[PDB]
């Protein structure tokens, strides 16, 4: 059972700008997604201080980067707080409405796309390199869900039946045909060293078979 939702007009407009604006510094997508993972891990670590049982779904707080040349996918896995169904459908887009308006006014005032993180909508930078994005997420208070969008103004949400995750978020980037450089180990290493060297969680870059 797959539910289809329309993006808010502002979010759909933001995704279209990201996809259609000529902008060569696409590598900032990884910094934005790692930053999102670090924030999600900060939240579950803080919540577990006053409630240790919140880590029953997993004590390890880490980030994994998994490239797959056969599927042409780059997966960013974290064991952070995860996202509920209400987050995927309502809460995140509601928060992102103000940030999108501020971001686009800034772009008209001379800012560039790499500053998208300062407006709270860095997740959508994934569409600089991905034609489709799948998000598998599990929050302690909800079920495991699969969020998916190839842009175009709509996204889907379903209950995920795949391998259980315990807790956290998995962002699967189905890369565009000309963006396969972000599957190479040397390239991912360079980006992490350049933009995410001081993230306070272990980042493990998986290598390919
Ligand atoms: O709206 C902004 C935003 C920030 C972080 C994550 C996110 N997601 C949309 C659904 C998948 C996850 N959106």
UniProtKB/Swiss-Prot annotation:
Outcome when changing residue 82 to D: Abolishes ATPase activity
Region annotation (Interaction with NR3C1) ranges: 1-209
PTM entry text: ISGylated.
Entry binding sites for ATP: 36, 78, 97, 123
Record PTM N6-acetyllysine, positions in chain: 43, 69
Location in or out of the cell: Nucleus; Cytoplasm; Melanosome; Cell membrane
Family listed: Belongs to the heat shock protein 90 family.
Domain statement: The TPR repeat-binding motif mediates interaction with TPR repeat-containing proteins like the co-chaperone STUB1.
Oligomer status and interactors: Homodimer. Identified in NR3C1/GCR steroid receptor-chaperone complexes formed at least by NR3C1, HSP90AA1 and a variety of proteins containing TPR repeats such as FKBP4, FKBP5, PPID, PPP5C or STIP1. Forms a complex containing HSP90AA1, TSC1 and TSC2; TSC1 is required to recruit TCS2 to the complex. The closed form interacts (via the middle domain and TPR repeat-binding motif) with co-chaperone TSC1 (via C-terminus). Interacts with TOM34. Interacts with TERT; the interaction, together with PTGES3, is required for correct assembly and stabilization of the TERT holoenzyme complex.
Purpose of the protein: Molecular chaperone that promotes the maturation, structural maintenance and proper regulation of specific target proteins involved for instance in cell cycle control and signal transduction. Undergoes a functional cycle that is linked to its ATPase activity which is essential for its chaperone activity. This cycle probably induces conformational changes in the client proteins, thereby causing their activation. Interacts dynamically with various co-chaperones that modulate its substrate recognition, ATPase cycle and chaperone function. (Microbial infection) Seems to interfere with N.meningitidis NadA-mediated invasion of human cells. Decreasing HSP90 levels increases adhesion and entry of E.coli expressing NadA into human Chang cells; increasing its levels leads to decreased adhesion and invasion.
Name used for this protein in its record: Heat shock protein HSP 90-alpha
Native species: Homo sapiens
Shown residues in whole-protein numbering: 16 to 224 of 732
């Amino acid at each position: 059972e797959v539910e289809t939702f329309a993006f808010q007009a502002e979010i759909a407009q933001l995704m279209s700008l990201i996809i259609n604006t000529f902008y060569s510094n696409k590598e900032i997508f990884l910094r934005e997604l790692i930053s999102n993972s670090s924030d999600a891990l900060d939240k579950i670590r803080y919540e577990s201080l006053t409630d240790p049982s919140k880590l029953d779904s997993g004590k390890e707080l880490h980030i994994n980067l998994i490239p797959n040349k056969q599927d042409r996918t780059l997966t960013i896995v974290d064991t952070g707080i995860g996202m509920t169904k209400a987050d995927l459908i309502n809460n995140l887009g509601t928060i992102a409405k103000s940030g999108t308006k501020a971001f686009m006014e800034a772009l008209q005032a001379g800012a560039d796309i790499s500053m998208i993180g300062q407006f709270g909508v860095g997740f959508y930078s994934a569409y600089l390199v991905a034609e489709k994005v799948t998000v598998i997420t599990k929050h302690n208070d909800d079920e495991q869900y699969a969020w998916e969008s190839s842009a175009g103004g709509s996204f889907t949400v379903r209950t995920d039946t795949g391998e259980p995750m315990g807790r956290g978020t998995k962002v699967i980037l189905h890369l565009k045909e000309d963006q396969t450089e972000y599957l190479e180990e040397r390239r991912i290493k360079e980006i992490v060293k350049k933009h995410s060297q001081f993230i306070g969680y272990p980042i493990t870059l998986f290598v390919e078979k």
